[PDB]
């Protein structure tokens, strides 16, 4: 198991997290060398919440509004934060790439903080910044043009808070939510799909890894056929379909989310939202944040898709 996640199961229903996922510090001064200025804002001290801004280089050296992009990282719902080296190195090169004012959530973690916390959290990240008098925020950032954006498990959350923004547009002015962004969203069910069985022995996310997740993550006594598990009602695709958000569902062949990933893309077509969908061939799950040249491919089409 330390072979697929880096945490100890104890005998008590709890985790320990023995192994140190590196981080990186905010850097929010453009004497700095980086190409992009980034620094951490305290959303929530009840529940440890904040949020890290990314704000590319570029955004000071002219006088325009870049598209607001609020991201959720990936994890299992059980591990990693905002500032997590593989996150924090993902975003800035999103922000140069696709050109993005990043507002990137460290939400709550399971089994600590089971589902629905970390979608309430999202939820708080959108009042919040609505609110938010923030000087990047308000100097370099256009409200007007909002994703919502998430990996894996943090495309789940992306996908749960879209679902409830929409509920609620009108309440969030002077922000727009214009689209939402699921690069591997993380989704299951009770019953193994095609992809599921297909790849019961990956040598990243096998069935037991999965199987275990949902456990530490789902309500108490819940199935993996619970709706924040599996997506698939759906009155509120009408609501996303009325609002004329576009949403984009990316993964790859050799992720056993595959099925439910495309799945949930045939629904949201099949019901008339506006869908982009990119569903490639090989690969593997998260390869976009260990391959400079996947990700990189992956930037001209969410730039495409941004404006």
């Known amino acids: 198991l330390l072979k ?22 905010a850097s929010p001064d453009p004497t700095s060398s980086s190409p992009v200025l980034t620094k951490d804002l305290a959303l929530n001290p009840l529940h440890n919440t ?41 975003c800035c090169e999103m922000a140069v790439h696709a050109g ?26 959108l009042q919040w910044i609505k609110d938010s008098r923030d000087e990047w925020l308000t100097n370099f950032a256009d409200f007007s043009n909002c994703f919502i954006m998430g990996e894996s498990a943090g495309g789940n959350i992306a996908y749960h808070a879209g679902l409830r923004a929409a509920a609620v547009a009108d309440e969030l002015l002077p922000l727009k939510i214009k689209g939402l962004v699921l690069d591997e969203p993380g989704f299951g069910g009770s019953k193994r799909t095609g992809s599921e069985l297909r790849l019961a022995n990956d040598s990243r996310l096998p069935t037991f890894v999965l199987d275990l997740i949902w456990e530490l993550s789902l309500p108490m006594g819940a199935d993996r056929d619970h709706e924040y598990c599996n997506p698939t009602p759906l009155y509120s695709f009408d609501k996303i379909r009325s609002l004329g958000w576009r949403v984009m ?26 869908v982009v969908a990119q569903f490639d061939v090989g690969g593997y799950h998260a390869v976009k944040l260990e391959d400079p040249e996947k990700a990189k491919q992956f930037f001209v089409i969410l730039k495409k898709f941004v404006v």
């Open 50 to 90: 904040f949020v890290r801004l990314f704000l590319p280089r570029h955004a000071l050296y002219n006088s325009a509004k870049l598209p607001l992009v609020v991201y959720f990282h990936g994890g299992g719902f059980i591990l990693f934060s905002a500032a997590s080296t593989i996150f924090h190195d993902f």
């Open 100 to 125: 993005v004012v990043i507002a990137s959530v460290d939400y709550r973690l399971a089994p600590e903080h089971r589902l629905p916390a970390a979608y309430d959290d999202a939820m708080e990240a």
């Open 249 to 274: 569902v990316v993964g790859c062949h050799g992720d056993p989310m595959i099925d439910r990933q495309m799945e949930l893309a045939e629904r949201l077509e099949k019901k008339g939202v506006d």
């Open 4 to 25: 697929y996640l880096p945490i100890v199961l104890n005998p008590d229903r709890t985790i320990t997290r023995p192994i140190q996922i590196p981080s990186t510090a």
